[PDB]
């Protein structure tokens, strides 16, 4: 039985993403870290056989067979390295892997000039369709959902690209009657 540290990890575009793992057979001969991009299956990212550190790129992995704990740390997390992270353990050549619970690591955009704005955008291809874009809000403001059974908030999104500075961000909301203000009594933490 192998378990992993957070089910869920979101970090801005610069953090150290730190996932952990836990096997049971202290003697397990090997521990593997597999990455799972959206649209791929697990590709193998990195291996530990011995008790210590193993840097590889901006990765380090540390094992403790007298602590049963393997951990993978990503330094300078990138949009690009957001994926599912499976911690398998090959306790022997002749055994198959025993897989982990997983970890959905995701790299939020990092907003260095917090300039929050509730904008509202409009459906060109007509109707009375509009929605709200809550953009450029700090790396701290949390996001549950809305006030009724006729509204939707969506949490902070997830970047996909290695390079630029205009890497879009924001929550978005929409309602199901034209009555509700695009800046309603928001069920979340807000900051001007």
């Amino acid at each position: 039985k192998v378990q992993q540290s957070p089910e869920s990890l979101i970090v801005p575009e610069g953090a150290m993403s730190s996932l952990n793992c836990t096997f049971s057979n202290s003697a397990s001969q090997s521990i593997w870290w597999y990455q799972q991009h959206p649209g791929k299956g697990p590709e193998a990212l990195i291996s530990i056989f011995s008790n210590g550190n193993k840097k590889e790129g901006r990765l380090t992995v540390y094992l403790n067979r007298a602590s049963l704990h393997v951990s993978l740390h990503i330094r300078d997390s990138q949009p690009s390295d957001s994926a599912v992270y499976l911690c398998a353990v090959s306790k022997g050549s002749n055994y198959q892997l025993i897989w982990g619970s997983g970890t959905k690591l995701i790299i939020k955009p990092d907003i260095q000039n917090p300039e929050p704005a509730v904008y509202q955008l409009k459906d060109p291809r007509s109707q009375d369709s509009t929605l709200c874009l809550f953009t450029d809000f700090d790396s701290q403001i949390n996001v549950p959902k809305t006030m009724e059974s006729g509204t939707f908030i969506t949490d902070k999104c997830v970047l996909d690209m290695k390079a630029m500075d205009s890497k879009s961000n924001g929550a978005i909301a929409w309602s199901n009657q034209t009555s509700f203000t695009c800046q309603d009594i928001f069920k979340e933490t807000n900051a001007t």
Binding site: Q4, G41, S93, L97, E115, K122, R125, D160, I172
Partner: protein, 236 residues
């Protein structure tokens, strides 16, 4: 390296779903796994070489065959909504403890196929306030009401798939008991958005029914299909 097919699938309770994996490597072990939230992977069964499939951790409602050492096929004789999942195939050897993975099959099992419907894709054009005040322009694509959530969203600026400045919801929102929602933001330069010649298109690819499936309904069949909302750069 390894391939599976179908890559998506809708089934009705009671289905001859057979997923089929092929490793054009030379591996002698072949594995079928499934990934449901809370598990990374659970193995259902595996073949140690052409000939005998053996068993696994979850063999219940699943059988398999290894007619070739380059083809290992999983069958769900009678479907059930518990088999709704994502299915990964692997091919392995004794060269290493490292294994090689197929891209995925998304299988959803429903009681009524009439519920499978393509999304409504809407592209919301940038804000006046946004352009003027922040010199940037976010368009927002939003797809509502689709079932199931076998989709992929992609932006397409002037005929080229784009990734820079695109950020998209990780998972799909259950809008209702069927309709799923998904949103995505494309930010670009106001000077770029004002160019009347730059064409932004948001495309949702949706994977509904296989044409081998029956659809006696008053409406069109929800086959696999792209559905886009487009908009061009305006000036004011």
């Amino acid at each position: 390296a390894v391939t599976q097919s179908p890559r998506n699938k809708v089934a009705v309770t009671g289905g001859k779903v057979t997923l089929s994996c092929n490793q054009t490597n030379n591996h002698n072990n072949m594995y079928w796994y499934r990934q449901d939230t809370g598990h990374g992977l659970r193995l259902i069964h595996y073949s140690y070489g052409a000939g005998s499939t053996e068993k696994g951790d979850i063999p219940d409602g699943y059988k398999a065959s290894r007619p070739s050492q380059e083809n290992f096929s999983l069958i769900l004789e009678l479907a059930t909504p518990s088999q709704t999942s994502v299915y990964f195939c692997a091919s392995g050897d004794m060269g290493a403890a490292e294994v090689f993975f197929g891209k995925g099959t998304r299988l959803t099992v429903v009681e009524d196929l009439r519920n499978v419907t393509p999304p409504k894709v809407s592209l919301f054009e940038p804000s006046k306030a946004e352009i003027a005040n922040k010199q940037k322009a976010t368009l927002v694509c939003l797809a509502r009401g689709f079932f199931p959530d076998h989709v992929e969203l992609s932006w397409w600026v002037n005929g080229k798939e784009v990734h820079s400045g695109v950020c998209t919801d990780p998972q799909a929102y259950k809008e209702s008991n069927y309709s799923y929602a998904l949103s995505s933001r494309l930010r670009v330069s106001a000077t770029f958005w004002h160019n009347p010649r730059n064409h932004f298109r948001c495309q949702v690819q949706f994977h509904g029914l296989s044409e081998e499936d029956k659809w006696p309904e008053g409406s069109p069949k929800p086959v696999t299909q792209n559905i886009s909302a487009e908009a061009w750069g305006r000036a004011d």
